[PDB]
């Protein structure tokens with residue numbers, strides 16, 4: 001469910017998804033970071049917003065597949081959450097779903113842009129953890 005905030009842990013490099021105050025999105029290995037606590041909320045069934053509890057910014061994906069933090073919950077902020085094996089989830093941009101653009105992190109912690117993601121990568125698998 002979606003009551004409590006979560007960390008989204010990425011198996012690829014072992015990073016928690018992070019939305020920085022300047023709107024940059026990346027990953028960090030630092031479990032104590034203030035900007036990795038995310039409040040997921042559901043829209044329609046299987047659609048979620050992913051919001052920084054610290055800054056209130058929403059996870060968003062731009063027209064080049066780059067993740068960024070959005071002040072407002074625009075249509076670029078809706079993601080399709082799908083449960084995969086081992087309780088890992090994927091998050092697909094709803095706006096770009098027909099191209100299968102996933103939320104993803106590289107092994108160095110940088111965003112893996114939507115067009116470079118693909119089913120099967122560790123980059124796109126996120127395990128929700130309690131804060």
Ligand SMILES: [Cl-]
Nearest residue numbers: 111112113116
């Ligand atoms: Cl990339």
